């Protein structure tokens, strides 16, 4: 009984997708297939710095008058950038649907990058990075990406190195903007109280101008030892399947089974036919090795001794999860934008439920043995990590002598 | 690559291949070695 997500396509290739609902406020966003993976180490912070500059005024709406408009209807303006996708989204009322779309049009095209602003946003970005190091789990996940995807464009961070940040100019930005903002790589997603025909007419009216035009995991280890920190963050991952491979669903159930360290989180990060599947835990130094041992045992148990009850529990946790999420308008629009960018279509919740209920214990331990057993992991540690075991002990913990 | 996935990845099978191989290796080694010694002397 969930309403279907209807997708149309303009000549430009900008797929305009919408999923109407009763709620009177909507989350209209633009999703662009452009991240740090498309950068070539000479413009490693171009997407981040453009994400900073995108709200500082356009040609038609110069400066803060633009954001005065998004204050005037009381709407909320957000943007984010990952290694593969960039999103500019607005939460607003339903009756303010046209102007919001027009605002989004300016943000993607006709944007103005002021040289004055460029210096101010450089100091913002530089400073934030200079303090970003504070967030450990971000440092650990960046270290994990770097050591797992050495030599590839997937190792480099979204923010880029301070070097590039300082060394960036309007023209470079202009390039990234004019290169990675093509209309066939763009989705206009709407969720909530929107009509699809009105949104399609608004996309035809504005946004109809957008121009139309080997990933490798390396089993490795990075250890940033700094003994003055009170807690240690350790992430261990193996290679993921990618977006389009359905056993992701089964792997999600495996994560739902795992769900000793103060904080233990499992992740399945997916990129275009690659990814990182693993666990991040933050712990006191004198516990670290025991955690690792614990964690590896659970993975091998999922490779060898999965039972039906924990599989049923993981399926229930996954169902609830995906359905708990996909609740508010934003979460949904976000799903529409990512689904049109990655799968090329919006997968409905009934298909997700079918793919969940076809998962049993035998195929779960088969897929877990395919992806976890006897695999070389990527390890990233930060903090008092002397008792964190080196690569032979972790690699030996990636299998059992008793199977 | 097939061998790894078949007899060298599961430790139990790893042991099986080792034991079985060793069982035959002796036959081969002794035979081959003896041939050499005899040829020498």
């Amino acid at each position: 009984s969930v309403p279907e997500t209807q997708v149309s396509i303009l000549d430009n290739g900008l797929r305009v997708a919408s999923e109407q609902s009763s709620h009177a406020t909507c989350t209209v966003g633009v999703w662009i297939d452009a991240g740090s993976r498309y950068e070539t180490e000479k413009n490693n912070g171009a997407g981040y710095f453009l994400e900073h500059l995108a709200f500082k005024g356009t040609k038609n709406r110069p400066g803060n008058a633009l954001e005065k408009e998004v204050e005037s209807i009381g709407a909320h303006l957000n943007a984010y950038s990952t290694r593969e996708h960039t999103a500019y989204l607005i939460k607003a009322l339903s009756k303010d649907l046209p102007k919001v779309v027009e605002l989004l049009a300016d943000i993607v095209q006709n944007s103005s990058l002021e040289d004055s602003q460029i210096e101010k946003e450089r100091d913002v970005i530089l400073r934030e990075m200079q303090e970003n190091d504070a967030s450990m789990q971000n440092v650990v996940f960046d270290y994990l990406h770097a050591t797992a995807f050495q030599g590839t464009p997937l190792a480099q961070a979204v923010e880029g190195p301070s070097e590039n940040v300082r060394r960036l100019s309007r023209t470079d930005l202009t390039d990234y903007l004019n290169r990675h903002y093509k209309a066939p790589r763009m989705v206009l997603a709407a969720a909530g109280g929107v009509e699809h025909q009105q949104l399609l007419d608004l996309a035809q009216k504005h946004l109809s101008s957008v121009s139309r035009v080997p990933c490798r995991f390396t089993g490795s280890e990075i250890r940033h030892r700094d003994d003055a920190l009170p807690l240690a963050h350790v992430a261990i991952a193996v290679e993921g399947p990618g977006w389009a491979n359905p056993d992701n669903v089964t792997l999600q159930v495996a994560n739902a089974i795992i769900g000793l360290c103060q904080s233990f989180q499992t992740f399945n990060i997916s990129y275009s036919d690659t990814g990182l599947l693993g666990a991040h835990f933050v712990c006191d130094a004198m516990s670290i090795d025991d955690m690792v041992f614990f964690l590896q045992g659970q993975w091998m148990r999922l490779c060898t001794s999965a039972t039906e009850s924990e599989v049923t529990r993981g399926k229930n946790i996954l169902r609830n999860a995906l359905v708990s999420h996909l609740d508010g308008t934003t979460p949904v629009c976000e799903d529409i934008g990512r689904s049109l960018l990655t799968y090329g279509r919006r997968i409905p919740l009934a298909e997700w439920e079918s793919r969940i209920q076809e998962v049993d214990a035998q195929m779960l331990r088969d897929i877990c043995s395919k992806y976890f057993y006897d695999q070389c992991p990527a390890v990233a540690g930060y903090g008092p990590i002397e008792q964190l075991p080196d690569y032979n002990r972790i690699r030996s913990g990636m299998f059992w002598l008793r199977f | 690559s097939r061998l790894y996935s078949l007899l060298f990845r599961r430790t139990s099978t790893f042991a099986l291949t080792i034991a079985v191989g060793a069982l035959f290796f002796e036959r081969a080694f002794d035979q081959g070695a003896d041939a050499i010694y005899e040829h020498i002397n």
Partner: peptide, 24 residues
């Protein structure tokens, strides 16, 4: 921060692809 430098090159170490992993 933590992004200033990239993992050092191991090319003189790295061998010359799950296809190969199985063999390796």
């Amino acid at each position: 921060s933590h992004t200033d430098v990239k993992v050092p090159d191991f090319s003189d170490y790295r061998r010359a692809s799950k296809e190969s992993s199985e063999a390796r």
